[PDB]
Amino acid sequence: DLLNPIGVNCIRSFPGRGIRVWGARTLSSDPAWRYLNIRRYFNYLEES
Amino acid sequence: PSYLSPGVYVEEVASGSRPIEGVGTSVAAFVGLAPTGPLNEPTLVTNWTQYVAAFGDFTGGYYLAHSVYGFFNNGGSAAYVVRVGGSAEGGLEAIDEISMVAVPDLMAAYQRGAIDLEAVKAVQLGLIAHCELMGDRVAIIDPPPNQNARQIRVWRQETAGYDSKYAALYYPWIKSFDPATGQSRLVPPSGHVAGIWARNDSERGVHKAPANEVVRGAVDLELQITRGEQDLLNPIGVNCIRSFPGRGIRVWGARTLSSDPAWRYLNIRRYFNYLEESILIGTQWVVFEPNDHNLWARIRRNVSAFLVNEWRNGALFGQSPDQAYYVKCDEETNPPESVDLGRVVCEIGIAPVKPAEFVIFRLAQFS
Amino acid sequence: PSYLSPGVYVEEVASGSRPIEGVGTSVAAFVGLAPTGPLNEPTLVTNWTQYVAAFGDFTGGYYLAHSVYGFFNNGGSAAYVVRVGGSAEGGLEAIDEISMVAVPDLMAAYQRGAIDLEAVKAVQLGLIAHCELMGDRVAIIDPPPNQNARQIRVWRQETAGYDSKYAALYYPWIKSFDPATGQSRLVPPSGHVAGIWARNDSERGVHKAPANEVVRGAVDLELQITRGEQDLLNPIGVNCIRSFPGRGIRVWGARTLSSDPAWRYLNIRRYFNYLEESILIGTQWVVFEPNDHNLWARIRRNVSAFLVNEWRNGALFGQSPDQAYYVKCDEETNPPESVDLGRVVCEIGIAPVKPAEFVIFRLAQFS
Amino acid sequence: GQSRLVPPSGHVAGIWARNDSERGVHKAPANEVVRGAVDLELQITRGEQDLLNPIGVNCIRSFPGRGIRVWGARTLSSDPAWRYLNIRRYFNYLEESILIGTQWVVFEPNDHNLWARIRRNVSAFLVNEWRNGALFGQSPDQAYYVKCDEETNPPESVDLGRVVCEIGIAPVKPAEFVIFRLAQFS
Amino acid sequence: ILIGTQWVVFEPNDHNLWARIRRNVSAFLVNEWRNGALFGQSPDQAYYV
């Protein structure tokens, strides 16, 4: 909860599910491009 | 709530039902003198065997044992006992469940010790003041032993006005048996009326006035009252114990000491005390709340449910729920200036029921 | 504000609501003599156990213990105690919450010490002057013990004119019980009236005149007043304690010592003191302000909200808010010459309510 | 293994954190149980509390049947505008959020499109805050108001490059005194 | 009337008190009239408070 507000993702160990990615964020102060999937989809659309 | 990390959060919304329960009103506290036992301790008794094992039984000729036996004879459930003193030759403010207080053995000191009338008047006034301060208990009073008509009516008005709306006075004394000597002797009617009240509260609801009940356990009265004498004592708060030819000894009058016509009857006061106690006990969760219209809706729902449950037992006068009660809590009674200081009103109004005292027929002849 | 560098600035505009709250008027300060305890220290007591642990209880035959017991018997909340002296054989100006002051044990020195009448008159005049200087407290006065009609009416006019509009005198003494000797004896009515005032202020609003209240613990009076004698004492600021056949001992008259007809009644003075204290406490933020019409609008809004909240409880005489109060703060009452010196007026006018003393019916016969 | 007296410093902070976690920050921590304690070495009656309530002194009260609980939820402020703690906490939260999430607006062409965007963003944030019950009002129109137009942005003001965006909200206050009537009517 | 009115003394003296007094007197007079002790076909013609 201290690292989530900043663009720092995590790799977390869960007791029963193992090692998993967690957070799926990027380094951007602008709230328009907070998430990675939006940027990837926009890049795909622009290239096409 | 605060959301800062991904995951699954489970929370419970406070919106629901919070029922309010009643309280038991069948506990009495007797203060008196006993031969042996704990001193200045409010002991709890629930059966004669406990009283016999603790404070003895019928050896000093005191009025505490007779009163306790009469209270348990009329269907009592639980009692508190305070022993001021005695021979072998109180802190009632710390208790909560007590509903009535009595001092059965007080005229004994007046009869032999010659403690004058000023001391008795001061003790009774102090008991009345304590009852008024507590706001939950009702006092039972008895007059001096040897009086008749045209005397008690004086003693009530020129010497013992009392009023205070928190008392009930029972005039005639009761002659009862004593197995220690196996003889009949006179005792004040202190525990018997408490037992009758407990029996009425157990068999029926607290809204029923204990007006017609048989004083089980007595034998005589040493006094007789006609219709005219009762008609002279009825306007003032003096009840009676009447002998009927075919029905025996019965209570009669069911009134209290109050000049104000608002609290003439005992059952209204008892029901109001019960409602106030229940509301005070089952509402404390409302303090320190966001104070929005949701809180008003919840309070209205809870009060309406409680009042509907009370009305469905026949304790309120009305053919429909709309004519029996009304609860108001909205923006009309909560202006922004009032809610600025953090206040909730929740106006409540009920319509009680009153006992039927005079029954009149006509028996007319018509074509 | 000053803007010199690029960025984001967050500021709060003072425009809003600033509610004004009331003050507690149920604190009394008793000055007297006690056997043992702290000396010349205004101790705070809130229950008899504290008084018993600090200043003892019923051992020197003084009037402080009786007054404190009577005050706590009539529903008192918190008290201040000052002990001038005593045997085992005040700085009230530093306190703020005190609402009334009494000196219950003063006639004791007059009865045995032979301190003459000049000393008593000087002490009472000093207390009156202190009450007037403070401008927040009300004094309770009692007369010398052994007097009757045609004497007190002299003692009030040729010796103890007093007036000053900041006092209330209670004529008859009260006979009360003492458990140390278990005997009845006479005491002045000093703490009982304070307890009655506190009870009236707690149960109902401060605008209700304590005219019909029962003195708890009152046994006898050692004097009887007819209608004519009361009609001779009513025009002057002498209240009474009357015995009614069926209602007991009750207060009667609810008046004060003031020749000016503007402050005849006690409730008006109490309400004005409450309003003045509330306004003085909850207004200090207005000093050193830009003094524009926005400030006038804010002050008018706050005062109007407070007055509306006060009126909605039924403490002001009027069917509509327009007929109950009026607040004026505009350019008509604030000329440029006045605002040059930096002054604000904010004229306020209210219409109080007065108690109903004489009730008259007609009972006419008409066709 | 012994009992000893300590000041109430960390317990109140823990209670504040618990209240902020379970419920929103707008709820006043007025009725919470001090887990971990045992005694108080002092007792307060109603009158003493009534003497301490007008001043900014809170209390920890023992109730016969409910135990040790916080009581009063007030602060040290003579000004009647900030009497309660929850108002101050909510205002701090709002100010911090606004300061953090607005920096993109600086150095913009400063046309009516920017005003529309700012108004839309602030209105969305305020609606989201209000839908959780943290603002007093039956309708969104009675809960908040945001003004950013040509009325509050004259050409003289926009000459220097200034944006105002007046914002006004209506907070909620805790209910301290609960009063019933219990009247008798026909 | 003398016996059952003493509670009215020392009251705030507002229109609520007037309404209460009028209601009480009207109820008493209606109860008295319904027994046939007053001359009138309607309550309006029997009394006025």
Numbering used by the authors:
A (entry chain B): 390 to 437
B (entry chain A), C (entry chain M): 2 to 90, 249 to 526
D (entry chain H): 341 to 526
E (entry chain G): 438 to 486
The authors write:
A conformational change in the baseplate complex triggers the contraction of the outer sheath, which leads to the propulsion of the inner tube into the target. Similar to the recently described sheath structures observed in AlgoCIS15 and tCIS19, the CISSc sheath is composed of a single protein, Cis2.
To obtain insights into the structural details of the CISSc contractile sheath-tube module, we performed single-particle cryoEM (helical reconstruction) of purified sheath particles from WT S. coelicolor, which had a homogeneous length for the contracted sheath of ~140 nm. Contracted sheath proteins adopt a right-handed helical array with an inner diameter of 115 Å and an outer diameter of 233 Å. Cis2 monomers consist of three domains and are well conserved in S. coelicolor and S. venezuelae, sharing ~65% sequence identity. From the resulting map, it was possible to build de novo domains 1 and 2, which contribute to the sheath wall. The additional domain 3, which is located on the sheath surface, seems to be highly flexible and could not be resolved.
